[PDB]
Swiss-Prot record:
It is found in: Cytoplasm. It comes from Enterococcus faecalis (strain ATCC 700802 / V583). The modification Phosphoserine is found at S46. Keywords: Cytoplasm, Phosphoprotein, Phosphotransferase system, Sugar transport, Transcription, Transcription regulation, Transport. SUPFAM superfamilies: HPr-like (SSF55594). PANTHER family: PHOSPHOCARRIER PROTEIN HPR, PHOSPHOCARRIER PROTEIN NPR. Gene3D superfamilies: HPr-like (3.30.1340.10). This is Phosphocarrier protein HPr.
């Protein structure tokens, strides 16, 4: 299991295209991937879950990756957050 904290700085927060690309990336892995904000956790492979969380600019979030491809899954997520300018 891998866990990492991130501070969201995009003006859009996790919404619109930045949110869809993130979920698409998460969806490529077999591990369980969860996003947690202010104590509530959602499946990062679910666009509905992510939208329900309502993560805006300045938010502190935690991502947990747990499974057979968790090393490359966490790495890919870190890469994607930085490439999209989310965190």
């Amino acid at each position: 299991m891998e866990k990492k904290e991130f501070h969201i700085v995009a003006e859009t927060g996790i919404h619109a295209r930045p949110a869809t690309l993130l979920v698409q990336t998460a969806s490529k892995f077999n591990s369980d991937i969860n996003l947690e904000y202010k104590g509530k956790s959602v499946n990062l492979k679910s666009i509905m879950g992510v939208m329900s969380l309502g993560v805006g600019q300045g938010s502190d979030v935690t991502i947990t990756v747990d499974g057979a491809d968790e090393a490359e899954g966490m790495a890919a997520i870190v890469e994607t957050l930085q490439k999209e300018g989310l965190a």
